[PDB]
Amino acid sequence: GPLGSYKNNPSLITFLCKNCSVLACSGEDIHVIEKMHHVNMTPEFKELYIVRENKALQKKCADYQINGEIICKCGQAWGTMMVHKGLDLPCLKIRNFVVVFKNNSTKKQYKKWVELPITFPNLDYSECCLFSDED
Ligand SMILES: [Zn+2]
């Protein structure tokens, strides 16, 4: 049975690949930016996703330089690889991922992180302005 308490913990939930369903990362293993942008500051995840050479995604004239479109092993557009002055911030899309609850044996498929009733942390990359070398 369930016999649980709360389910608003990103520790019980995890992200998977829609196409497949491989654990790419966990909610708790994710950071938020102004609760407006979802950036996955996971290094190990860099070995779970592959970027393909495509300009159909990234753009020159912009403020957020992208590398292309991130895709799982199978090749499922996990989202996109955003860059900030040379930073690495992979923006995944729940519309390409899945959410599996640990508390109870179930699998919920969302579209946006906003749909996630689970509360997330708040990590402001800007916090560090050291690396800042460019103008
Ligand atoms: Zn896959």
Question: How far from chain centre, in Å, is Cα 1?
Answer: 31
SS3 at position 36: coil
Task: Supply the CATH number for residue 86's domain.
Answer: 2.170.150.30
The experimental method behind these coordinates is: NMR
User: And the tokens for 69?
Assistant: 């479109």
Domain around 76: 1-135
Ligand 1 center–CA 52 separation, angstroms: 15
For residues 48 and 25, give the distance between their C-alpha atoms in angstroms, rounded to a whole number: 9
Ligand 1 center–CA 25 separation, angstroms: 13
Taking a C-beta distance cutoff of 8 angstroms, is the pair 118, 29 a contact? Answer: no
Q: Supply the DSSP symbol for 80.
A: E
SS3 at position 82: strand
Question: Has 72 been labeled as part of a binding site?
Answer: yes
Number of domains in the chain: 1
For residues 103 and 2, give the distance between their C-alpha atoms in angstroms, rounded to a whole number: 7
Amino acid identity, residue 104?
N
The CA angle 97-12-111, to the nearest 5 degrees, is 25
Ligand 1 center–CA 98 separation, angstroms: 11
Amino acid identity, residue 119?
T
For residues 26 and 12, give the distance between their C-alpha atoms in angstroms, rounded to a whole number: 8
